[PDB]
Amino acid sequence: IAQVQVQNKLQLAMPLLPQEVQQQGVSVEKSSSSFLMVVGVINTDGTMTQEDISDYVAANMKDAISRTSGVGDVQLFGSQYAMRIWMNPNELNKFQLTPVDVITAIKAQNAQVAAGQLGGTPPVKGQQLNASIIAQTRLTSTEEFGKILL
Amino acid sequence: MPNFFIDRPIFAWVIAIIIMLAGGLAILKLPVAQYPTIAPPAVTISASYPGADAKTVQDTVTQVIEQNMNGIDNLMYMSSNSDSTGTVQITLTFESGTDADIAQVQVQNKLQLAMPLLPQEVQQQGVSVEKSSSSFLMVVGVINTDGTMTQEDISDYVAANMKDAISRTSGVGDVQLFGSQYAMRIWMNPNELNKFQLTPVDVITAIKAQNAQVAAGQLGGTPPVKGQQLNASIIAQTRLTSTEEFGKILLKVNQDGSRVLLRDVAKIELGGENYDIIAEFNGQPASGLGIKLATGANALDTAAAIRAELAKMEPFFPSGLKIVYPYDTTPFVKISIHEVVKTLVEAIILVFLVMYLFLQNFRATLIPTIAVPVVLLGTFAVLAAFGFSINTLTMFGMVLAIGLLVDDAIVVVENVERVMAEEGLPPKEATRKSMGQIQGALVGIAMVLSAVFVPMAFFGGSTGAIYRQFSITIVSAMALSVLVALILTPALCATMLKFGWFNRMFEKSTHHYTDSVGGILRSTGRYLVLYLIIVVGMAYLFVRLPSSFLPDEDQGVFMTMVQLPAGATQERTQKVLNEVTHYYLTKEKNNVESVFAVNGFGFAGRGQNTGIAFVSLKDWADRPGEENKVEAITMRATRAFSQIKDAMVFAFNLPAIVELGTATGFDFELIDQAGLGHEKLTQARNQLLAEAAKHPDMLTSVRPNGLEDTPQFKIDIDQEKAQALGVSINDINTTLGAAWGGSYVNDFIDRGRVKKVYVMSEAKYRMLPDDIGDWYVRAADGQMVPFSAFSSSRWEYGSPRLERYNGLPSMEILGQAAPGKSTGEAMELMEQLASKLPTGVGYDWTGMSYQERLSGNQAPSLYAISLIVVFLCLAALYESWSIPFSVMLVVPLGVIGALLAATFRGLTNDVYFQVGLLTTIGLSAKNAILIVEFAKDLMDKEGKGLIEATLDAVRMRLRPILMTSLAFILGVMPLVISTGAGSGAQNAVGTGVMGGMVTATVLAIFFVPVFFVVVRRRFSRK
Amino acid sequence: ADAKTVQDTVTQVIEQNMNGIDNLMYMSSNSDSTGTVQITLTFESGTDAD
Amino acid sequence: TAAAIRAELAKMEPFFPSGLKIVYPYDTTPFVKISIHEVVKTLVEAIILV
Amino acid sequence: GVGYDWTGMSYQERLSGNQAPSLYAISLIVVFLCLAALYESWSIPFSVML
């Protein structure tokens, strides 16, 4: 309960938080101040980096560990990868663009979305062939992004 | 005690009255319900996004959504599928017997956060979070019989008018709809619409602000001005509330006073919300309403009340509203129940009759017969005292118990009409000294006994529970008995207690019988050989005896499996259903009572491609033999249902306990592990599978439980051109979207009930890649362009459904053990075959195969602890690390009688039989104790001589044993062992004992006296 | 500005739904002009509120 | 928990990249394991002086 | 097509009413029976209870 009770209330300020909080979701949890336990993960053959690890780790194992009883908070000594768009001003000052511009890009060319489909759900008189209609996908490599057309 | 009680037996009747009273309150205070609660508590998480496709749900949806299920408490494992029609299930099964209210919270309330990055399309249709269960109490259906009502008008009405009816009645654990409720439908046509230079968009926004709700002051309320007197409430804009009002939206005005309404671009109409599940019952528009328990009410009352409620209310809304019940779990209980107390009741009767025969008497057969009932009736408030409840598990729980209730009664009165015969005092000291010799024995055979039962309430999971049902029952029954025979029986029969051949003619075979045996015991160890044979041989049987859970049972309903091929489609899957309707209505009128089939479900995943069809038979009555029942009706179907097209149609009987661990089968999920993608996994998936079938030795039938890559028609917006042509990528996307997957504008209220509104183009314009075209965007300049303008089409393959095991992509494969082999030795091959696959590809077990794996085998360790405490108790009924060792070697004698349910009958080692196989080693080793007591009693007291005792001690026993032994073996052979319908576990319960009882006697009489000496003498040697 | 408007819009829904829920004795709502609504559940005594 | 955590990872160890080792720094478990056993020895032990 | 129930105090009230004629009954019967056991006499109670 408490954990309960608390998020009854919370929950009625969701919808006043700034969208950007919001959206990195808020968390509630119960647990111990101190740490149970710390789990190194280095790599032998200098085969990956500081970064690389922290992605693998988050991509790999921060999961299950948080999702896993009485584990009730795993810090993560690192961060997972993200699509990164270290801008440069000079330029967008040159070709005459602001991040705003850059951004709106990023939502458009990097995006998943939702057609419908050919055997049309409520269909017609009398039809064979039904199948989905796929449009825009979600970008997927360093590359896709910054070939985005500005 | 029973000495201080024989005395005041006026008391041991008060005692006999509370105990009794308490099972009347408790009979009343008792739940009743087909089974109890034996599956682990899952929460499912349902989601929808009109027109997605998989990646586009998996990556807009499942994920993240995963990613953040992360700090709920007891969870076992999670999966998750995302398929091609919006949906996301996401069940998360949890540890043994958590709190369901508390999981579900948590689960969800940690959803609450989630949402923020769930996409505005979803956010709006709701994710709901809720509890496993996807079949229970009854399923009312609502039909027309005019051709008046389509689906939707029927679904509507149901939702309109009865759904809450019902969903509030004593029971009724929630209602769920076999339809929709009207929808403001709004079917665009890019023609009648490009003519105005209008996209769906402008249709969209229009319907938005033409139909909303706008705030608006009062007149005072706030701070007002000196001396007002008017407060009212201003009433701005209000939801539209018809097809009319809707057809009147100024989508455009051109300078000619121009009137571009909605219906001038579309067509308004009351519609359904989802259009893609065609439900009919008997050829006929349908719209059922499923409805589940209530958690601690009573299947029996509850159905009543729902039948009730319908009945008051079909005096209403026009045409035929005929309300069928094409599923009820109602009979199947009642009809059980009725046949269960039929068992008790009669197994008493039998005591009485097998009570003339052994005792010329009457006020003695009047004893067992007010003592069982008083042992039952209290075993009703023990149940109600550990919550339990009245269900097919618990019921049979006391029938596989009868044997030991009964016995314990005759056991006491009959020690009395031995000792009050064989030169003995009146009732008085007859009892006092009678009771006396059994007193200790009677107790102490608690202990020993409890130890061969308790164990069993400790087991695994889903399974363990069934067992615990059985375990308590028996215990608190049996252990109830003892206590009632040390108290109401000593003082009962001690207070009322005073052919032409059989009498002296039994006093014949007895004499003749102990001779025989007196030679057995000259030789001595002669038969100990003829024993090890009988040991040895059990051992051969145990192994041979097949395994399981609960023998399937006929339930008066089963199912048909339609499953049209790749890209199928509704229209063309109906036809299939219509045949699986016909070839059920026609070639089976004397049994099909009602086909209720529906396309767009087949729990393999949804979509015009698949339906499923539940038929519900006529009453078992009207179904004579073998051929007229299920296994059999379905037999013929299945075979008569191949010869059909290229459309695979199966039929099958539901499993025992719907919600639970079916086949003895395995469940095997392939997980993903790294980068490997859909494809790579699809590679592993296949390799492994193919592997598997080159090993029919370990036997098998591995299957992907899930779907092939089908082809995908793929648009593909050309961003450059689109800027270029002056055309917003939102307008494209949208317009394609709402043309084709429809979108859901806002709501409106329809004769009192807010109801969604959907906007999406007629079908005519939306069927074939070839129509893409009809569809035209306004772009920046008033120039209405088309697709080819800025988009290109290509076919692809990809997934309609997409698997993911806790957090992460995963397939799913299930197959059988092996005519030959064990579920366990088969797991273990399938895991070597899994050993040697492309790195990345993991593999892990679910369902059943978490059960079976985890706990799984424990028969062993739990039985050590009985066969141990059986000893430690037993020896201190005796004072001897050795004499007890004679009461044991009984165990097998009883087994082989049981186990020849192999080679006389077509059966398998299954809970119903083990639980038997328990009940039989009660009677048995307590024969053993009594006997080897009587054989102790002499020797210890009046030294009555090494064997002199053994021969005398059986000498005085062969009745009691033969007495109940006779009661039972008839007690069980009734319907139990021969039965038409509502049965099965009937057969299971009996055949077990019935056979295991035989020997438990027939072997016992001779051996046990053997045993006694064989061991009392060996332990004082040379 | 919305009388019945609320009662059909939030209140109803929230009610249709208040089934299942153990130990529940009676429920009792009421819309409102200002658009506030109070559904209310009350359960058989000594039930576990939390 | 620790057992579970530990035999989670343990469950995802045959499939990390190239050379990547869970190591094990600061973990507070095994003392409370050893410790609480330390005592136990003492029970048996001073069974044996008595 | 119109009717009623009670709420709060009342529905408590009515509930507390119709309960007595059991509360007496069962309580009697419990004593009568106690006396029996106690005074070993299926008869002595009859007295007392009268």
Ligand SMILES: COc1cccc2c1C(=O)c1c(O)c3c(c(O)c1C2=O)C[C@@](O)(C(=O)CO)C[C@@H]3O[C@H]1C[C@H](N)[C@@H](O)[C@H](C)O1
């Ligand atoms: C793992 O759960 C299940 C497993 C197997 C197959 C099934 C289900 C299942 O739950 C299920 C349903 O719950 C429902 C239906 C159903 O056919 C099945 C299964 O086949 C049919 C239904 O959609 C109609 O017949 C409507 O015309 C009604 C109902 O909808 C339910 C389920 C929705 N997903 C839910 O959000 C809604 C309110 O109730």
